[PDB]
């Protein structure tokens, strides 16, 4: 399960892992995990769910311009949907000290492209323009924004789940269980009553954000 | 499907429905919907998903204090989990001009209680304390907070879904589809490519917020 560090941490002893707030770490109060090759232990309460690296919903151009402009690397970006003209997507990149826009076009035959080359998904396009520059300026790569830990994502339980086996997380119906990993289609890694663990997606209806 | 008004609207005709931003509406570019008893039409891109009315995750006491204090009614409240001491919940209420808390404790066999009576869910507790006061000052009732529309919640699609019949929403593998209603365990009402509609949950993996 990966996760983003939410607080910095200094190796409290020799079996640990030193990370800065915002680092993404590939992860009984302490999980073992790994960061840049070197690995070790990590307190449970210092990690949170890894947010979307680049899809920034309907984040308006201003804000787009803002957070992106304030970044320690050229080619930092997000992809955003239009509030206004809904069905439309637009790339935004950190060019020098400025945000340089690009409309991403979808040719009816389900495919997104910016100019000449067509792809089957915005991701494919993205990684495509990780190494193959997004302009006649053969440097401007798309590298992920310096990401920061966000408020916890919380699901709610429909039916009690007495934790059948070891690793399973127990919760009653009504329980607000804090979700740490949810990338997997049937088993989500939550945290619920002091203990943390796996739990079947299908027993839990979401709790929509409000902060 | 319910929804929170995102922008104020003035009844642009005789079949309409003016609502102020934050209003919760019981909801081809115009949905037919109803408000205070009288109903009519509403533009589709003036509504967003109804957030959780009272569960405010790991919202710190300060903040709790903060937004709760700024409320147009006594008894406004939230329920929040505690950043530090994980497994515990605490109610916060708008008493006159100030926030008065109460630890919600759970008694072993999974039940939440404030003092004398036990319930099997925070919800059960909350509705209990809507009619039946939460002090000895026999008015303090749990009135839900003046709710305001949040950032859109977006799922991503695992597998194409040529829409089987219409009301169904069509999208390819990779598409970031915007969720309006996801209360129902198997069929979520999204909005994906100009068109909006139903689509089975099992086809989309979430997209974690970062704004």
From Swiss-Prot, chains A, B:
Chain positions found as N6-acetyllysine: 6, 44, 103
Start and end residues of each SH2 domain: 54-146
Entries under PROSITE patterns matching the protein: SH2, SH3
GO cellular component, one term: vesicle membrane
Main subcellular location of this protein, as a coarse class: nucleus
Residue numbers carrying Phosphothreonine: 205
One biological process term in Gene Ontology: cellular response to ionizing radiation
Localization terms from the record: Nucleus; Cytoplasm; Endosome; Golgi apparatus
Residue(s) carrying Phosphotyrosine: 203
Disulfide bond entries: none
GO molecular function terms listed in the Swiss-Prot or TrEMBL record: ephrin receptor binding; epidermal growth factor receptor binding; guanyl-nucleotide exchange factor adaptor activity; identical protein binding; insulin receptor substrate binding; neurotrophin TRKA receptor binding; phosphotyrosine residue binding; protein kinase binding
Domain notes: The SH3 domains mediate interaction with RALGPS1 and SHB.
Family membership noted in the UniProt record: Belongs to the GRB2/sem-5/DRK family.
Alphabetized PANTHER family for the sequence: PROTEIN ENHANCER OF SEVENLESS 2B (PTHR46037)
Designated name of the protein: Growth factor receptor-bound protein 2
